[PDB]
Amino acid sequence: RMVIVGKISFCPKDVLGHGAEGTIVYKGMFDNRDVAVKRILPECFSFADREVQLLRESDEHPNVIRYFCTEKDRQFQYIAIELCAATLQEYVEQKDFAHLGLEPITLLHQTTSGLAHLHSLNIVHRDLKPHNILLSMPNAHGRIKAMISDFGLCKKLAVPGTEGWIAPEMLSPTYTVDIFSAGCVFYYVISEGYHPFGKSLQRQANILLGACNLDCFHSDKHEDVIARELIEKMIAMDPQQRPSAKHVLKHPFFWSLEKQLQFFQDVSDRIEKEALDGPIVRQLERGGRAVVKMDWRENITVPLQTDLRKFRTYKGGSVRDLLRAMRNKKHHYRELPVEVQETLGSIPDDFVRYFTSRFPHLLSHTYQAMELCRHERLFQTYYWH
Amino acid sequence: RMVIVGKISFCPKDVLGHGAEGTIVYKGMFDNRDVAVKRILPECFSFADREVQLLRESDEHPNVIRYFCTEKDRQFQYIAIELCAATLQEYVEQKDFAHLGLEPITLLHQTTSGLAHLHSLNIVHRDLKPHNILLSMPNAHGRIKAMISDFGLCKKLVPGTEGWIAPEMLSPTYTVDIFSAGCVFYYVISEGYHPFGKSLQRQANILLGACNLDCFHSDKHEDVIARELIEKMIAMDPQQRPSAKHVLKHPFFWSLEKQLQFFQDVSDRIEKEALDGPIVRQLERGGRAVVKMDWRENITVPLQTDLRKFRTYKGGSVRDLLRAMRNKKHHYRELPVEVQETLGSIPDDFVRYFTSRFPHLLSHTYQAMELCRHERLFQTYYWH
Ligand SMILES: Nc1ncnc2c1ncn2[C@@H]1O[C@H](COP(=O)(O)OP(=O)(O)O)[C@@H](O)[C@H]1O
Ligand SMILES: Nc1ncnc2c1ncn2[C@@H]1O[C@H](COP(=O)(O)OP(=O)(O)O)[C@@H](O)[C@H]1O
Ligand SMILES: *Cc1cc(-c2ccc3c(c2)OCCN3C)cc(OC)c1O
Ligand SMILES: [Mg+2]
Ligand SMILES: [Mg+2]
Numbered sequence: 001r002m003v004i005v006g007k008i009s010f011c012p013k014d015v016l017g018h019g020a021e022g023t024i025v026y027k028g029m030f031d032n033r034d035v036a037v038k039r040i041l042p043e044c045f046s047f048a049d050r051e052v053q054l055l056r057e058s059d060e061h062p063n064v065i066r067y068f069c070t071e072k073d074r075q076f077q078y079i080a081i082e083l084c085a086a087t088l089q090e091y092v093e094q095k096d097f098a099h100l101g102l103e104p105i106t107l108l109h110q111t112t113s114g115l116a117h118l119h120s121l122n123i124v125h126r127d128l129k130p131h132n133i134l135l136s137m138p139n140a141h142g143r144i145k146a147m148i149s150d151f152g153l154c155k156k157l158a159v160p161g162t163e164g165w166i167a168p169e170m171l172s173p174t175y176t177v178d179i180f181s182a183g184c185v186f187y188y189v190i191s192e193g194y195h196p197f198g199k200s201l202q203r204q205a206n207i208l209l210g211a212c213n214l215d216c217f218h219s220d221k222h223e224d225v226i227a228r229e230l231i232e233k234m235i236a237m238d239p240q241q242r243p244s245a246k247h248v249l250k251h252p253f254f255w256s257l258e259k260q261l262q263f264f265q266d267v268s269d270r271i272e273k274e275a276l277d278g279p280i281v282r283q284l285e286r287g288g289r290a291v292v293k294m295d296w297r298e299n300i301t302v303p304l305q306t307d308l309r310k311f312r313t314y315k316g317g318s319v320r321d322l323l324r325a326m327r328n329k330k331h332h333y334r335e336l337p338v339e340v341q342e343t344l345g346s347i348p349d350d351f352v353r354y355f356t357s358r359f360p361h362l363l364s365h366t367y368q369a370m371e372l373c374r375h376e377r378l379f380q381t382y383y384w385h
Numbered sequence: 386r387m388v389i390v391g392k393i394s395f396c397p398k399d400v401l402g403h404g405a406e407g408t409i410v411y412k413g414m415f416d417n418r419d420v421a422v423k424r425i426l427p428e429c430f431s432f433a434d435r436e437v438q439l440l441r442e443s444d445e446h447p448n449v450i451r452y453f454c455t456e457k458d459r460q461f462q463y464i465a466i467e468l469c470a471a472t473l474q475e476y477v478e479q480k481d482f483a484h485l486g487l488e489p490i491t492l493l494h495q496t497t498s499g500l501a502h503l504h505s506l507n508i509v510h511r512d513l514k515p516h517n518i519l520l521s522m523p524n525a526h527g528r529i530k531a532m533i534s535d536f537g538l539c540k541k542l543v544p545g546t547e548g549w550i551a552p553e554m555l556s557p558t559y560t561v562d563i564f565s566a567g568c569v570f571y572y573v574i575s576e577g578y579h580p581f582g583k584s585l586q587r588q589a590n591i592l593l594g595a596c597n598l599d600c601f602h603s604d605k606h607e608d609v610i611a612r613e614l615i616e617k618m619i620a621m622d623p624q625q626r627p628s629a630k631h632v633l634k635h636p637f638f639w640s641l642e643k644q645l646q647f648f649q650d651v652s653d654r655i656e657k658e659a660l661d662g663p664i665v666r667q668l669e670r671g672g673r674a675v676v677k678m679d680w681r682e683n684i685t686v687p688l689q690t691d692l693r694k695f696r697t698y699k700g701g702s703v704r705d706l707l708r709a710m711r712n713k714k715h716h717y718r719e720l721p722v723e724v725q726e727t728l729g730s731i732p733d734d735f736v737r738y739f740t741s742r743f744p745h746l747l748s749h750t751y752q753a754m755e756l757c758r759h760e761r762l763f764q765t766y767y768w769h
Contacts (some may be wrong), residue, residue, distance in 0.1 A: 006525055009526075029525065031418065032418070032467075032522060032524070033416070082417075083417075140389060140391055140393075140414065141389065
């Protein structure tokens with residue numbers, strides 16, 4: 001029993017799912033492609049054709065879903081969007097929805113990026129949640145991407161946003177409300193379903209209080225330490241403490257294994273031929289013993305320790321020495337004995353995961369102390385301005 | 386066993402059809418649309434990006450297909466276009482083809498409007514033919530539409546396809562397309578035949594100037610007009626061929642309502658004009674033949690029974706047959722029910738009532754009333 005008003009056509013029996021306050025979404029058509037069509041009560045939700053036009057007239061960013069065309073029926077409003085396979089909540093809640101085929105952290109880099117694109121054109125999303133981060137259907141080689149949908153519309157005194165993800169200062173807007181929401185979603189994904197506030201019913205309450213958890217992050221894992229450090233600044237109750245949408249992208253939390261290793265070698269070079277009295281070297285072993293674990297020669301594999309002893313030249317209490325030794329072994333890698341090669345290798349992946357596995361706080365620390373040289377030529381890929 | 390060449394993609398098993406010079410067409414993908422992919426050997430066919438980009442840069446005509454995007458393989462070229470349900474070939478020939486919601490004359494009209502659009506952008510097709518006029522798939526409310534494709538491509542290894550090639554290109558401008566068009570016109574209308582007219586001898590006889598048009602009776606109106614236009618379209622002198630938009634203004638396309646309206650406007654215009662007048666004189670030039678000696682004797686008994694009371698009606702004079710037309714149509718409401726039922730309902734059955742009996746009436750009037758071409762009333766009827 002089809003309908004037209006098109007432009008967009010559809011059938012009312014192909015219901016994708018109900019939205020907020022009347023708004024419902026069915027599966028319709030357009031050119032001759034399958035499309036998701038969303039009917040909204042003009043009395044409830046206010047489209048901003050202005051923003052969306054700034055989006056169209058601007059260059060396509062592949063992580064912000066596209067609005068095909070808009071139609072204003074006499075009593076309604078109708079919108080057409082890319083029939084995505086699922087929202088983030090599907091991806092997160094049934095691991096086997098068949099990603100297959102799409103990494104969590106890259107999903108987060110995409111989401112955060114599309115968001116950076118939105119914040120670029122001075123448009124704020126104001127309702128970021130897993131239900132508004134949709135995953136497309138398999139591409140040409142069967143890859144899947146992440147796009148932010150349902151951005152640009154709002155409510156007209158029927159508080160913007162959705163209970164559970166509403167930045168706290170918006171209860172009592174700029175980009176920070178979107179950053180906060182995003183932080184909650186990073187935690188939603190990484191932790192495979194939990195929320196930092198954390199159960200549905202007391203969620204918005206605890207947000208307004210300041211109650212977090214992040215109990216998923218052990219403090220003995222490199223990965224978890226970095227994730228925690230980022231999310232904390234993301235969901236900071238003082239909205240000024242919240243990272244810029246792009247600042248988030250630049251953070252360690254995303255870095256390739258190659259990137260991390262490179263960072264260790266680059267630090268090891270830049271702090272070389274630099275005296276101990278200097279600011280950098282002084283600051284770098286400020287935490288000293290703690291990150292190195294007293295003697296770092298003592299925490300590693302036997303072959304490595306054996307080889308190292310023959311040079312030392314190597315402290316064991318100095319982070320700087322662990323970095324110099326890392327850089328060194330990476331440099332002379334091919335001409336190293338087979339024993340060590342097997343204990344360390346491959347490269348960069350297993351080589352850098354070797355040292356961060358055994359010094360969870362190494363990267364975190366080095367990166368913190370090396371903040372001094374943020375403006376330098378080499379360190380631009382690592383830090384923000 | 387999928388292929389790639391991003392962003393297009395297709396399973397090679399899902400073939401749609403083979404083409405000229407090794408060119409092949411498959412069913413594949415683009416965004417997430419099903420889409421037809423046409424791979425060409427870049428050594429045989431040259432794509433004209435400039436033209437197509439000009440098509441994109443202009444407003445979309447609904448009977449002109451859309452080239453989505455092009456990509457070059459290292460050894461090939463790929464081109465993606467709207468998947469269509471058939472070619473005009475099928476439309477015409479497969480007995481149980483649902484040409485649903487689409488009369489033939491409106492198909493040729495859509496086609497010729499698309500051509501007007503393309504000529505308007507100074508882009509010439511060069512290979513118009515049944516395989517290059519495609520049928521869409523049922524839209525929102527089911528309606529089927531036709532569009533032209535494979536334009537903007539050419540051949541490098543003579544343009545055109547054997548059987549639809551203008552003669553003088555052998556011995557290019559828009560005239561070639563008008564000609565080939567004329568051919569497909571007859572083809573569609575004749576329900577399968579060709580003006581020239583058998584596959585092997587087609588091109589040959591076109592060179593020779595041999596036509597056919599045998600499906601065109603001289604006692605049925607439709608045939609007479611279709612003929613009237615096709616003949617001009619498939620002339621051997623490319624200077625005779627009417628412009629793509631000119632072909633549109635032609636009678637062949639008019640709804641019966643328009644036809645009847647033309648007879649009325651003509652009847653009105655001619656009234657109060659001297660019978661020696663060059664226009665009246667011209668209108669009656671063909672005379673006798675078209676009114677069938679005494680047009681009063683060539684109409685239903687009730688109508689002549691009712692016409693006998695007035696005349697005033699010469700009976701050998703198109704001016705009077707046309708005036709009776711206008712006058713009965715006007716005073717229709719008051720006319721006896723007998724006459725009402727031999728005639729009605731207006732416009733369709735009524736204008737049919739006259740064109741049926743006087744097949745040439747319309748053709749003839751149209752030709753003779755070309756003298757008032759420029760007048761403001763007669764712009765909907767004629768080409769300025
Ligand atoms: N662009 C889309 N493509 C496919 N499904 C969609 C799309 N947008 C929304 N949906 C589906 O419709 C449901 C309701 O969406 P919406 O009405 O915007 O409320 P929500 O805030 O939950 O997204 C969602 O669960 C989602 O599955
Ligand atoms: N858009 C399309 N959709 C479906 N089939 C098509 C399409 N375009 C072309 N074809 C099929 O491919 C065949 C060959 O097309 P092509 O290689 O362009 O040569 P030609 O057009 O001269 O026949 C046609 O006869 C037609 O059946
Ligand atoms: C671990 C390590 C190894 C070397 C090193 C120096 C010189 C040579 C070498 C390895 O192998 C091939 C050729 N060659 C003479 C040097 C180091 O200190 C800079 C360290 O730490
Ligand atoms: Mg939504
Ligand atoms: Mg074709």
